[PDB]
Tab-separated table of C-alpha atoms and ligand atoms in Angstrom:
chain	number	residue	atom	x	y	z
Q	2	UNK	CA	-23.082	12.352	-15.297
Q	3	UNK	CA	-22.572	10.736	-18.748
Q	4	UNK	CA	-20.721	7.390	-19.307
Q	5	UNK	CA	-19.648	6.071	-22.692
Q	6	UNK	CA	-19.302	2.261	-22.665
Q	7	UNK	CA	-17.099	0.980	-25.438
Q	8	UNK	CA	-17.568	-2.757	-25.557
Q	9	UNK	CA	-17.925	-5.133	-28.468
Q	10	UNK	CA	-19.968	-7.783	-26.578
Q	11	UNK	CA	-23.634	-6.752	-26.483
Q	12	UNK	CA	-24.261	-8.933	-23.366
Q	13	UNK	CA	-21.493	-7.212	-21.305
Q	14	UNK	CA	-22.363	-3.792	-22.659
Q	15	UNK	CA	-25.954	-4.354	-21.510
Q	16	UNK	CA	-24.928	-5.428	-17.988
Q	17	UNK	CA	-22.773	-2.297	-17.518
Q	18	UNK	CA	-25.480	-0.065	-19.115
Q	19	UNK	CA	-28.154	-1.530	-16.819
Q	20	UNK	CA	-26.059	-1.025	-13.738
Q	21	UNK	CA	-24.886	2.502	-14.588
Q	22	UNK	CA	-28.486	3.483	-15.395
Q	23	UNK	CA	-29.615	2.212	-12.010
Q	24	UNK	CA	-26.979	4.415	-10.372
Q	25	UNK	CA	-28.393	7.459	-12.200
Q	26	UNK	CA	-25.778	7.895	-14.960
Q	27	UNK	CA	-26.722	8.722	-18.543
Q	28	UNK	CA	-25.244	6.007	-20.799
Q	29	UNK	CA	-24.066	6.114	-24.446
Q	30	UNK	CA	-22.664	2.954	-26.024
Q	31	UNK	CA	-20.179	2.068	-28.796
Q	32	UNK	CA	-19.340	-1.366	-30.143
Q	33	UNK	CA	-16.047	-0.648	-31.923
Q	34	UNK	CA	-13.171	1.780	-32.036
Q	35	UNK	CA	-14.640	3.993	-34.716
Q	36	UNK	CA	-17.981	4.399	-32.865
Q	37	UNK	CA	-16.047	5.101	-29.612
Q	38	UNK	CA	-14.236	7.971	-31.214
Q	39	UNK	CA	-17.438	9.344	-32.793
Q	40	UNK	CA	-19.380	9.060	-29.540
Q	41	UNK	CA	-16.516	10.590	-27.650
Q	42	UNK	CA	-16.434	13.789	-29.854
Q	43	UNK	CA	-20.190	14.117	-30.224
Q	44	UNK	CA	-21.293	13.257	-26.677
Q	45	UNK	CA	-18.355	14.508	-24.607
Q	46	UNK	CA	-18.810	11.918	-21.859
Q	47	UNK	CA	-17.567	12.496	-18.309
Q	48	UNK	CA	-16.022	9.037	-18.245
Q	49	UNK	CA	-15.312	6.213	-20.694
Q	50	UNK	CA	-15.225	2.441	-19.814
Q	51	UNK	CA	-13.167	1.019	-22.641
Q	52	UNK	CA	-12.676	-2.642	-23.651
Q	53	UNK	CA	-9.018	-3.163	-24.743
Q	54	UNK	CA	-10.218	-5.565	-27.511
Q	55	UNK	CA	-12.529	-3.999	-30.178
Q	56	UNK	CA	-13.383	-4.744	-33.900
Q	57	UNK	CA	-12.213	-1.347	-35.957
Q	58	UNK	CA	-9.693	0.353	-33.629
Q	59	UNK	CA	-8.020	-1.533	-30.570
Q	60	UNK	CA	-8.825	-0.099	-27.142
Q	61	UNK	CA	-5.157	0.883	-26.797
Q	62	UNK	CA	-5.389	2.827	-30.048
Q	63	UNK	CA	-8.739	4.494	-29.032
Q	64	UNK	CA	-7.317	5.649	-25.711
Q	65	UNK	CA	-4.141	6.880	-27.372
Q	66	UNK	CA	-6.075	9.086	-29.763
Q	67	UNK	CA	-8.448	10.332	-27.079
Q	68	UNK	CA	-5.471	11.534	-24.955
Q	69	UNK	CA	-4.323	13.675	-27.884
Q	70	UNK	CA	-7.138	16.135	-27.096
Q	71	UNK	CA	-8.719	15.162	-23.768
Q	72	UNK	CA	-8.102	14.340	-20.148
Q	73	UNK	CA	-11.466	12.507	-19.824
Q	74	UNK	CA	-11.062	9.622	-17.399
Q	75	UNK	CA	-10.755	6.175	-19.009
Q	76	UNK	CA	-11.393	2.942	-17.143
Q	77	UNK	CA	-9.999	0.018	-19.132
Q	78	UNK	CA	-11.842	-3.292	-18.816
Q	79	UNK	CA	-10.378	-6.580	-20.056
Q	80	UNK	CA	-10.224	-10.377	-19.743
Q	81	UNK	CA	-6.402	-9.998	-20.070
Q	82	UNK	CA	-5.062	-9.828	-16.571
Q	83	UNK	CA	-1.307	-9.952	-16.828
Q	84	UNK	CA	1.108	-7.312	-15.601
Q	85	UNK	CA	2.060	-6.451	-19.164
Q	86	UNK	CA	-1.624	-5.763	-20.094
Q	87	UNK	CA	-2.366	-3.592	-17.107
Q	88	UNK	CA	0.832	-1.679	-17.324
Q	89	UNK	CA	0.474	-0.980	-21.094
Q	90	UNK	CA	-3.170	0.108	-20.650
Q	91	UNK	CA	-2.141	2.491	-17.829
Q	92	UNK	CA	0.852	3.805	-19.754
Q	93	UNK	CA	-1.177	4.372	-22.935
Q	94	UNK	CA	-3.500	6.581	-20.788
Q	95	UNK	CA	-5.992	4.464	-18.799
Q	96	UNK	CA	-6.708	5.825	-15.347
Q	97	UNK	CA	-7.641	2.390	-14.246
Q	98	UNK	CA	-7.752	-1.174	-15.462
Q	99	UNK	CA	-10.284	-3.658	-14.176
Q	100	UNK	CA	-10.418	-7.310	-15.333
Q	101	UNK	CA	-13.366	-9.437	-16.477
Q	102	UNK	CA	-15.249	-10.883	-15.002
Q	103	UNK	CA	-15.749	-8.052	-12.559
Q	104	UNK	CA	-17.845	-7.194	-9.626
Q	105	UNK	CA	-20.666	-4.825	-10.511
Q	106	UNK	CA	-20.285	-3.025	-7.158
Q	107	UNK	CA	-16.510	-2.592	-7.626
Q	108	UNK	CA	-16.968	-1.203	-11.113
Q	109	UNK	CA	-19.395	1.330	-9.695
Q	110	UNK	CA	-17.035	2.240	-6.864
Q	111	UNK	CA	-14.160	2.722	-9.267
Q	112	UNK	CA	-16.226	4.857	-11.696
Q	113	UNK	CA	-17.212	7.127	-8.750
Q	114	UNK	CA	-13.543	7.250	-7.638
Q	115	UNK	CA	-12.459	8.385	-11.108
Q	116	UNK	CA	-15.225	11.098	-11.184
Q	117	UNK	CA	-14.414	12.307	-7.667
Q	118	UNK	CA	-10.888	13.020	-8.940
Q	119	UNK	CA	-11.683	14.871	-12.121
O	2	UNK	CA	25.391	12.718	-38.121
O	3	UNK	CA	24.975	11.439	-34.519
O	4	UNK	CA	23.339	8.058	-33.611
O	5	UNK	CA	22.341	7.031	-30.103
O	6	UNK	CA	22.240	3.224	-29.734
O	7	UNK	CA	20.114	2.100	-26.836
O	8	UNK	CA	20.820	-1.567	-26.331
O	9	UNK	CA	21.318	-3.601	-23.191
O	10	UNK	CA	23.533	-6.296	-24.803
O	11	UNK	CA	27.126	-5.049	-25.017
O	12	UNK	CA	27.901	-7.497	-27.893
O	13	UNK	CA	25.035	-6.180	-30.111
O	14	UNK	CA	25.681	-2.589	-29.122
O	15	UNK	CA	29.304	-3.036	-30.219
O	16	UNK	CA	28.361	-4.533	-33.607
O	17	UNK	CA	26.011	-1.611	-34.392
O	18	UNK	CA	28.566	0.942	-33.044
O	19	UNK	CA	31.335	-0.579	-35.185
O	20	UNK	CA	29.222	-0.531	-38.295
O	21	UNK	CA	27.824	2.983	-37.811
O	22	UNK	CA	31.351	4.270	-37.121
O	23	UNK	CA	32.570	2.730	-40.360
O	24	UNK	CA	29.804	4.578	-42.209
O	25	UNK	CA	31.015	7.879	-40.712
O	26	UNK	CA	28.368	8.431	-38.002
O	27	UNK	CA	29.246	9.684	-34.528
O	28	UNK	CA	27.936	7.129	-31.998
O	29	UNK	CA	26.742	7.538	-28.378
O	30	UNK	CA	25.539	4.475	-26.476
O	31	UNK	CA	23.107	3.724	-23.619
O	32	UNK	CA	22.484	0.402	-21.921
O	33	UNK	CA	19.147	1.090	-20.214
O	34	UNK	CA	16.121	3.327	-20.343
O	35	UNK	CA	17.437	5.895	-17.912
O	36	UNK	CA	20.751	6.320	-19.806
O	37	UNK	CA	18.787	6.556	-23.108
O	38	UNK	CA	16.790	9.455	-21.806
O	39	UNK	CA	19.894	11.186	-20.389
O	40	UNK	CA	21.861	10.690	-23.601
O	41	UNK	CA	18.911	11.831	-25.630
O	42	UNK	CA	18.617	15.229	-23.770
O	43	UNK	CA	22.344	15.832	-23.448
O	44	UNK	CA	23.511	14.682	-26.890
O	45	UNK	CA	20.506	15.521	-29.069
O	46	UNK	CA	21.135	12.695	-31.535
O	47	UNK	CA	19.869	12.821	-35.122
O	48	UNK	CA	18.548	9.282	-34.821
O	49	UNK	CA	18.012	6.688	-32.091
O	50	UNK	CA	18.169	2.848	-32.574
O	51	UNK	CA	16.196	1.597	-29.608
O	52	UNK	CA	15.937	-1.963	-28.222
O	53	UNK	CA	12.316	-2.601	-27.070
O	54	UNK	CA	13.657	-4.621	-24.073
O	55	UNK	CA	15.855	-2.642	-21.590
O	56	UNK	CA	16.742	-2.941	-17.814
O	57	UNK	CA	15.351	0.569	-16.115
O	58	UNK	CA	12.736	1.854	-18.599
O	59	UNK	CA	11.197	-0.442	-21.441
O	60	UNK	CA	11.919	0.677	-25.001
O	61	UNK	CA	8.198	1.382	-25.434
O	62	UNK	CA	8.294	3.664	-22.404
O	63	UNK	CA	11.534	5.426	-23.597
O	64	UNK	CA	10.052	6.138	-27.016
O	65	UNK	CA	6.799	7.329	-25.481
O	66	UNK	CA	8.580	9.890	-23.338
O	67	UNK	CA	10.878	11.000	-26.144
O	68	UNK	CA	7.837	11.783	-28.372
O	69	UNK	CA	6.545	14.138	-25.677
O	70	UNK	CA	9.200	16.678	-26.725
O	71	UNK	CA	10.850	15.468	-29.940
O	72	UNK	CA	10.299	14.238	-33.452
O	73	UNK	CA	13.775	12.599	-33.596
O	74	UNK	CA	13.564	9.459	-35.707
O	75	UNK	CA	13.473	6.185	-33.748
O	76	UNK	CA	14.322	2.823	-35.270
O	77	UNK	CA	13.111	0.038	-32.984
O	78	UNK	CA	15.163	-3.163	-32.961
O	79	UNK	CA	13.907	-6.391	-31.382
O	80	UNK	CA	13.997	-10.202	-31.299
O	81	UNK	CA	10.158	-10.036	-31.000
O	82	UNK	CA	8.821	-10.316	-34.494
O	83	UNK	CA	5.081	-10.652	-34.214
O	84	UNK	CA	2.506	-8.313	-35.700
O	85	UNK	CA	1.490	-7.150	-32.242
O	86	UNK	CA	5.119	-6.136	-31.400
O	87	UNK	CA	5.730	-4.243	-34.598
O	88	UNK	CA	2.416	-2.526	-34.570
O	89	UNK	CA	2.716	-1.418	-30.895
O	90	UNK	CA	6.285	-0.151	-31.461
O	91	UNK	CA	5.115	1.856	-34.510
O	92	UNK	CA	2.037	3.169	-32.723
O	93	UNK	CA	4.015	4.191	-29.624
O	94	UNK	CA	6.200	6.308	-31.996
O	95	UNK	CA	8.829	4.161	-33.763
O	96	UNK	CA	9.468	5.199	-37.340
O	97	UNK	CA	10.622	1.735	-38.082
O	98	UNK	CA	10.956	-1.670	-36.503
O	99	UNK	CA	13.646	-4.106	-37.533
O	100	UNK	CA	14.009	-7.603	-36.004
O	101	UNK	CA	17.083	-9.407	-34.655
O	102	UNK	CA	19.060	-10.875	-35.980
O	103	UNK	CA	19.385	-8.287	-38.704
O	104	UNK	CA	21.433	-7.605	-41.717
O	105	UNK	CA	24.094	-4.982	-41.092
O	106	UNK	CA	23.609	-3.567	-44.613
O	107	UNK	CA	19.813	-3.330	-44.179
O	108	UNK	CA	20.170	-1.561	-40.857
O	109	UNK	CA	22.435	0.961	-42.537
O	110	UNK	CA	20.031	1.420	-45.440
O	111	UNK	CA	17.123	1.964	-43.090
O	112	UNK	CA	19.040	4.467	-40.903
O	113	UNK	CA	19.889	6.478	-44.071
O	114	UNK	CA	16.224	6.250	-45.178
O	115	UNK	CA	15.057	7.668	-41.841
O	116	UNK	CA	17.645	10.545	-42.055
O	117	UNK	CA	16.769	11.328	-45.676
O	118	UNK	CA	13.201	11.943	-44.472
O	119	UNK	CA	13.866	14.161	-41.503
S	1	MG	MG1	-20.862	-0.960	-25.589
S	2	MG	MG1	23.992	0.430	-26.496
S	3	XE	XE1	-1.536	1.565	-29.571
S	4	XE	XE1	4.531	2.115	-22.733
């Protein structure tokens, strides 16, 4: 399976990439909203882990435009952990919303749960 | 022309109703998100003035669901006046975003501007 990780922090992106690779996923990466959209169209990932906060396009905006054409599962990841953040991510199309810092094992479990249902 | 005013404060709703009536619009009112959606389907207004903050459904959620079926112009009205509020209202489908308190004459000008282009 192919995962697109859209994250503007190279350290966090690498931790997720390393852990998804170890689980046997193919990983493509993007570091802003524009790259996320390009990688999305070109690579057709099975799932996208999307930071809400990105340099070019926000995460909310990326997920909005994705949902125009695609039902690809989106797992939103963010340091913002209030009700309003989670609810607005889910309502703008996230299938799930996990907060940072996260548990590596939980992330993996949640990715598998999204792919199981999809 | 018919305006639906979705506002949970009966005092503000009345001021907008009074002023739109004086301009020759037919007015229907709604005081929460559920009533907005019901009035929307039943009355088919030409334009909707929508408070962002409502008891049942938020304004963002109402405008989201409206846009599923309809291109009816939406003018979002709110006490929240930050960039993030305006931008997220516009991006969730508002044609315009005016802040409270507002100028009666400006509201009217902006309503006419939305109807002119529509
Ligand atoms: Mg990345
Ligand atoms: Mg009202
Ligand atoms: Xe957005
Ligand atoms: Xe929303």
